[PDB]
Structures are given as C-alpha cells and as structure tokens.
C-alpha cells in the first residue's frame with residue numbers, strides 16, 4: 001500500500017514535532033563584549049570656537 | 058580708556074584664555090586615553106559588520 005512520492009514532494013521543507021529541548025547555545029559561544037557607549041544629548045557649540053592656538057572662531 | 062575698562066577687559070581675556078588652555082590640556086588627555094583604551098568614540102578603527110553573516114541553514118550541519 002505504499003505510494004511513490006510525486007515530483008516535488010521529497011524536497012519539501014517539513015515540520016518535526018520533537019520532545020528534545022532547543023539548543024540555547026549550539027555554537028558554545030561565550031558572552032559578547034559590551035559595546036562602546038553611544039552619543040546622546042543635545043549638541044552644544046564648541047567652547048570658545050576651535051581653540052587652535054589663537055583663532056577666536 | 059578708563060583703567061576700569063582695561064582692567065575688567067583683561068579679566069575677561071584671562072578667563073577666556075585660561076578656559077581654552079584647560080580645554081586643550083583636557084583634549085590631549087582625552088586623546089591619550091582613547092588611543093590607549095579604544096573605548097571612546099575616537100580611534101574606532103573599523104571591524105567587520107556582522108550584518109553580512111548568512112544565518113541560514115547551510116548544506117552541511119557541522120558549522
């Protein structure tokens with residue numbers, strides 16, 4: 001009573017009902033380094049201009 | 058000019074230039090620390106963007 005699969009069927013992506021748990025770390029990866037702090041807040045102008053030796057703006 | 062005017066103008070000039078000098082010293086110290094530790098917004102030399110990684114299931118499982 002077995003029926004041969006039609007063309008296109010054995011290449012279907014199927015779904016599997018399992019009882020084993022999902023691997024929370026399949027790569028055995030460690031903790032990632034914490035990122036650099038972002039930029040935030042309002043942008044005030046430069047204090048006393050460019051401060052390049054004598055340029056007052 | 059009045060001596061009051063030159064005197065208080067000199068105090069204004071000295072405050073502005075002392076602030077600029079202290080800010081340049083802080084600028085040197087900030088640049089030294091950010092080159093040394095690499096934790097600030099400056100000297101952030103680029104690494105690989107991890108948005109380029111294909112996280113799809115590949116052809117072989119051991120990866």
Ligand SMILES: CCCCCCCCCCCCCCCCCC(=O)OC[C@H](COP(=O)([O-])OC[C@H](O)COP(=O)([O-])OC[C@H](COC(=O)CCCCCCCCCCCCCCCCC)OC(=O)CCCCCCCCCCCCCCCCC)OC(=O)CCCCCCCCCCCCCCCCC
Nearest residue numbers: 048049050051052053054055056057066069070073074077
């Ligand atoms: C109501 C709405 C409208 C409001 C209007 C308000 C304004 C009303 C008046 C309208 C006109 C305004 C003009 C600009 C504002 C005043 C700027 C000024 O005098 O700064 C003083 C500036 C600093 O003096 P200060 O006492 O600290 O500040 C007074 C003000 O607070 C200065 O203010 P500051 O603190 O904001 O200045 C910022 C900063 C202040 O400066 C600094 O922080 C210091 C560093 C400045 C540069 C130094 C470079 C040194 C090495 C290069 C040398 C270059 C060659 C020298 C000259 C060769 C011959 C041309 O300036 C700069 O960084 C700009 C660079 C210098 C250019 C100055 C403006 C020139 C305008 C006309 C251009 C024509 C040619 C001029 C000569 C070209 C060479 C400069 O003086 C100098 O640096 C000495 C150099 C000569 C200055 C130019 C004088 C302008 C008038 C020229 C008329 C004659 C032209 C003759 C024919 C052509 C030449 C043969």
